[PDB]
């Protein structure tokens, strides 16, 4: 099971982030994913400007004690100029949240050779108003279609076929009901044949297991130890030491 963990690292202090990076170094990352846009629910967007001040303090030094421990860094953006600054540092995967809702994404992914995660959404910010409702083989069906045409896009603009991932966007205009059921279907995902991100850790899906916010980890852990059985290339996580044990548990039962 050649499952990678992305170590998720929110930056909505720099010395913090720093420390947090340092600790999912040694807990087991394979990547540490820099974001600094909160797509909470209820987080109002903040300009692209605003986004890069947040990063352009810490990113150089994720970078470094990253890249020293054979750990790459993955940016969670939806803004193509966000991406290209922080490609310019050196990173190694635009986690493109917006899949291509910024036009001038592909052109950054191709004239960087980088790997591109696009992630399906109903428009963000999220919105109870934008959700899917009906049956959920054709809400998959349907993220197969957008994705498809997102990485035609890609290709079509000069971004090379092995460098992108596919993510189905757990929660986002997804309630939990369809967030399991996309999950446990994940395989029809991967069939496709590009690997597959996917981001269950702590959402929401899991208020219907009822299991509160603030005891998620353990949960998640379960549905690492599945996803990682299914041979989910990237798990985008927040507790790097319990996905490194779902992994490992994977593994012991191939
Ligand atoms: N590729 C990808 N990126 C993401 N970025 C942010 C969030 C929102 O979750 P958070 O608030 O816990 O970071 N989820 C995803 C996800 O599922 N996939
Ligand atoms: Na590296």
Redesign the pocket.
């Known amino acids: 099971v050649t499952t990678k963990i992305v170590g ?1 690292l ?1 930056v909505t202090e720099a010395n913090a982030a720093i420390r947090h990076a340092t600790d999912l170094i040694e807990h087991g990352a394979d990547v540490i ?1 820099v ?1 600094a846009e ?3 629910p209820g987080v109002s967007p903040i300009t692209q400007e605003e986004e890069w001040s947040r990063l352009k303090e810490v990113l150089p030094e994720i970078i470094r004690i990253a890249h020293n421990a054979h750990v790459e860094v993955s940016i ?1 953006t939806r803004n193509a100029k966000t991406a290209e600054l922080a490609l310019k540092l050196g990173v190694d995967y635009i ?1 493109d ?1 917006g899949g291509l809702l910024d036009p001038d994404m592909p052109a950054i992914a191709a004239a960087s050779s980088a790997k591109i ?1 696009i ?1 399906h959404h109903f428009g963000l910010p999220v919105s109870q108003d934008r959700s899917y409702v009906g049956q959920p083989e054709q809400l998959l069906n349907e993220i197969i279609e957008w994705l498809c045409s997102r990485v035609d896009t890609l290709i079509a603009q000069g971004v090379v076929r092995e460098r992108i991932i596919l ?1 189905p ?4 205009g997804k309630l939990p009901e369809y967030s399991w059921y996309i999950a446990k279907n994940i395989g029809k995902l991967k069939k496709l044949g590009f690997p597959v ?7 929401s899906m899991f208020s219907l297991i009822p299991v509160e916010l603030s005891e998620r980890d353990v949960p998640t852990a379960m549905l690492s130890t599945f996803l990682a059985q299914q041979q989910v290339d990237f798990l ?1 996580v ?1 507790d790097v030491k319990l996905t490194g044990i779902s992994i490992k548990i994977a593994n012991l039962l191939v």
């Open positions: 998720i929110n994913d974001g909160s797509t909470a969670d986690n949240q995660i992630m993510d966007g757990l929660g986002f991100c996917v981001g269950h850790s702590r959402k985008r927040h």
